[PDB]
Scaffold this active site. Structure first.
Site, PDB file in Angstrom:
ATOM      1  N   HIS A  44      51.585  34.912  26.289  1.00  0.00           N
ATOM      2  CA  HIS A  44      50.843  34.398  26.517  1.00  0.00           C
ATOM      3  C   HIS A  44      49.636  34.203  26.103  1.00  0.00           C
ATOM      4  O   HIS A  44      48.517  33.742  25.826  1.00  0.00           O
ATOM      5  CB  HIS A  44      50.116  34.225  27.736  1.00  0.00           C
ATOM      6  N   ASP A  93      55.757  37.766  30.982  1.00  0.00           N
ATOM      7  CA  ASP A  93      54.208  37.619  30.624  1.00  0.00           C
ATOM      8  C   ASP A  93      54.346  38.835  29.391  1.00  0.00           C
ATOM      9  O   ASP A  93      54.018  39.871  29.836  1.00  0.00           O
ATOM     10  CB  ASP A  93      52.738  37.646  31.007  1.00  0.00           C
ATOM     11  N   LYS A 160      49.137  39.771  49.220  1.00  0.00           N
ATOM     12  CA  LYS A 160      47.662  39.332  50.796  1.00  0.00           C
ATOM     13  C   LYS A 160      46.214  38.582  49.337  1.00  0.00           C
ATOM     14  O   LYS A 160      46.057  37.575  50.446  1.00  0.00           O
ATOM     15  CB  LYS A 160      47.106  40.260  51.013  1.00  0.00           C
ATOM     16  N   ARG A 161      46.241  39.002  48.653  1.00  0.00           N
ATOM     17  CA  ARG A 161      45.191  38.795  48.000  1.00  0.00           C
ATOM     18  C   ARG A 161      44.771  37.159  46.853  1.00  0.00           C
ATOM     19  O   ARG A 161      43.871  36.938  46.213  1.00  0.00           O
ATOM     20  CB  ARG A 161      44.139  39.594  46.522  1.00  0.00           C
ATOM     21  N   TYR A 162      46.276  36.881  46.953  1.00  0.00           N
ATOM     22  CA  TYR A 162      47.009  35.544  46.090  1.00  0.00           C
ATOM     23  C   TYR A 162      47.220  34.597  46.273  1.00  0.00           C
ATOM     24  O   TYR A 162      48.320  34.323  45.945  1.00  0.00           O
ATOM     25  CB  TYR A 162      48.280  36.537  44.874  1.00  0.00           C
ATOM     26  N   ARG A 163      46.768  34.305  47.682  1.00  0.00           N
ATOM     27  CA  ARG A 163      47.298  33.160  47.658  1.00  0.00           C
ATOM     28  C   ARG A 163      48.237  32.051  47.414  1.00  0.00           C
ATOM     29  O   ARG A 163      47.113  31.421  46.418  1.00  0.00           O
ATOM     30  CB  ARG A 163      46.831  32.613  49.671  1.00  0.00           C
ATOM     31  N   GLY A 186      39.870  38.775  26.719  1.00  0.00           N
ATOM     32  CA  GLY A 186      39.910  39.430  25.304  1.00  0.00           C
ATOM     33  C   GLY A 186      41.188  40.839  25.850  1.00  0.00           C
ATOM     34  O   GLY A 186      41.306  41.342  24.914  1.00  0.00           O
ATOM     35  N   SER A 188      43.680  41.151  27.693  1.00  0.00           N
ATOM     36  CA  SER A 188      45.537  40.725  27.619  1.00  0.00           C
ATOM     37  C   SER A 188      46.088  41.135  26.470  1.00  0.00           C
ATOM     38  O   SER A 188      45.787  41.161  25.589  1.00  0.00           O
ATOM     39  CB  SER A 188      45.521  38.597  27.197  1.00  0.00           C
ATOM     40  N   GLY A 189      47.814  41.877  27.105  1.00  0.00           N
ATOM     41  CA  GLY A 189      47.943  42.182  25.971  1.00  0.00           C
ATOM     42  C   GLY A 189      48.088  43.477  25.695  1.00  0.00           C
ATOM     43  O   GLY A 189      48.502  44.624  25.190  1.00  0.00           O
TER      44      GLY A 189
HETATM   45  C1  716 Z   1      43.619  37.302  28.560  1.00  0.00           C
HETATM   46  O1  716 Z   1      42.512  39.020  28.073  1.00  0.00           O
HETATM   47  C2  716 Z   1      42.947  37.122  29.897  1.00  0.00           C
HETATM   48  C3  716 Z   1      43.380  38.393  30.183  1.00  0.00           C
HETATM   49  C4  716 Z   1      42.944  38.736  32.281  1.00  0.00           C
HETATM   50  C5  716 Z   1      42.842  39.503  33.010  1.00  0.00           C
HETATM   51  N1  716 Z   1      41.835  38.672  34.417  1.00  0.00           N
HETATM   52  C6  716 Z   1      41.885  40.107  35.119  1.00  0.00           C
HETATM   53  N2  716 Z   1      40.754  39.878  36.453  1.00  0.00           N
HETATM   54  N3  716 Z   1      42.005  41.355  35.398  1.00  0.00           N
HETATM   55  N4  716 Z   1      44.101  36.342  30.601  1.00  0.00           N
HETATM   56  C7  716 Z   1      43.725  35.713  30.463  1.00  0.00           C
HETATM   57  O2  716 Z   1      43.645  34.612  30.437  1.00  0.00           O
HETATM   58  C8  716 Z   1      45.130  34.743  31.308  1.00  0.00           C
HETATM   59  N5  716 Z   1      44.254  33.442  32.029  1.00  0.00           N
HETATM   60  C9  716 Z   1      43.970  34.233  33.669  1.00  0.00           C
HETATM   61  O3  716 Z   1      43.577  35.308  33.901  1.00  0.00           O
HETATM   62  C10 716 Z   1      43.162  32.990  34.611  1.00  0.00           C
HETATM   63  O4  716 Z   1      41.989  33.243  35.024  1.00  0.00           O
HETATM   64  C11 716 Z   1      43.995  32.874  35.818  1.00  0.00           C
HETATM   65  C12 716 Z   1      45.256  32.450  36.157  1.00  0.00           C
HETATM   66  C13 716 Z   1      46.532  32.172  36.328  1.00  0.00           C
HETATM   67  C14 716 Z   1      46.453  32.147  38.044  1.00  0.00           C
HETATM   68  C15 716 Z   1      45.001  33.201  38.132  1.00  0.00           C
HETATM   69 CL1  716 Z   1      44.043  32.547  40.141  1.00  0.00          CL
HETATM   70  C16 716 Z   1      43.494  32.408  37.208  1.00  0.00           C
HETATM   71  C17 716 Z   1      45.718  33.383  30.206  1.00  0.00           C
HETATM   72  C18 716 Z   1      46.512  32.511  30.370  1.00  0.00           C
HETATM   73  C19 716 Z   1      44.734  32.179  29.547  1.00  0.00           C
HETATM   74  C20 716 Z   1      43.280  36.756  27.492  1.00  0.00           C
HETATM   75  N6  716 Z   1      44.139  35.436  27.007  1.00  0.00           N
HETATM   76  C21 716 Z   1      43.853  34.629  26.705  1.00  0.00           C
HETATM   77  C22 716 Z   1      42.907  34.456  25.656  1.00  0.00           C
HETATM   78  S1  716 Z   1      42.224  36.034  27.151  1.00  0.00           S
END
Ligand code: 716
Length: 237
Positions: A44, A93, A160-163, A186, A188-189
């Site tokens: 992603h 992912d 449980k934390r992600y309904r 940021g 991510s990955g």
């Molecule tokens: C990634 O660096 C971030 C990392 C998320 C880690 N978050 C955490 N709380 N441990 N990823 C994203 O921003 C992804 N989207 C989400 O996390 C978004 O808030 C979400 C998506 C689906 C369901 C819920 Cl409840 C919340 C991503 C899909 C955009 C990055 N990736 C791109 C830019 S920063």
């Protein structure tokens, strides 16, 4: 990374910072060196990326400040996204970046060992999430690589934390019931490193979560061990 601290240079030698040059160069996502020409990261992270030509992989980096126009980098020859990937929250992912050139291992840059299928019964009590991600839900790319120790949580607990969400066995979560420490935009990955028997293993890949470090909202990661066969298949010429 929320609630973490500055990493020691060379402490996470497998961690790389993936940049995009469009429109101007900036940090895009994190990643992990798993082979001399392979980076494992989140699929992603290439949303809107039409070509690997705009990507740049930097290894052995501690501070983004070390990255200048004259700084050497690895070009990306190919972006390999799992064919079942649709979006982070749905799972799958995971993606591979095949570098244009080989990485010369050194104390500043070396690969991390992938989890085994016989180690799925191991209890990780020493896992760390790292990255230049956000420190808050309204911050920017951190200069110094951050680290934070976070306990894994069972999938049953995570569900449980992600309904409304489906936490599958191909995902793995980590977080404090009270929040405070977690990955953020940021990161991510990035890799979710766990040390077991003096050996580090790439247990997860930072993927998603509701906000950042919120209470009762564990970070969600790609459960790497569930993709070792895919990784082998995609990395063999
Ligand atoms: C990634 O660096 C971030 C990392 C998320 C880690 N978050 C955490 N709380 N441990 N990823 C994203 O921003 C992804 N989207 C989400 O996390 C978004 O808030 C979400 C998506 C689906 C369901 C819920 Cl409840 C919340 C991503 C899909 C955009 C990055 N990736 C791109 C830019 S920063």
């Amino acid at each position: 990374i929320v609630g973490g601290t500055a990493s020691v240079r060379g402490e996470w030698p497998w961690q790389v910072t993936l940049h995009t040059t469009s429109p101007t160069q900036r940090h895009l996502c994190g990643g992990s060196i798993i082979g001399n020409q392979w980076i494992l990261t989140a699929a992603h992270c290439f949303y809107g990326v039409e070509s690997p030509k705009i990507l740049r992989v930097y290894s052995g980096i501690l501070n983004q400040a070390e990255i200048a126009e004259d700084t050497s980098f690895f070009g990306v020859q190919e972006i390999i996204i799992h064919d079942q990937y649709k979006m982070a929250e749905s799972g799958y992912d995971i993606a591979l970046l095949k570098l244009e050139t080989t990485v010369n291992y050194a104390d500043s840059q070396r690969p991390i060992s992938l989890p085994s299928k016989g180690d799925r019964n191991v209890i990780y009590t020493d896992c760390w999430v790292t990255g230049w991600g956000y420190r808050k839900l309204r911050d920017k790319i951190q200069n110094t690589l951050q680290k934070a120790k976070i306990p894994l949580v069972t999938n049953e607990e995570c569900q449980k934390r992600y309904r409304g969400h489906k936490i599958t066995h191909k995902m793995i979560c980590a977080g404090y019931r009270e929040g405070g420490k977690d990955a953020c935009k940021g990161d991510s990955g990035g890799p979710l490193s766990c040390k077991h028997n003096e050996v580090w293993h790439l247990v997860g890949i930072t993927s998603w979560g509701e906000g950042c470090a919120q209470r009762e909202r564990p970070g969600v990661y790609t459960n790497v061990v569930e993709y070792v066969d895919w990784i082998l298949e995609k990395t063999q010429a």
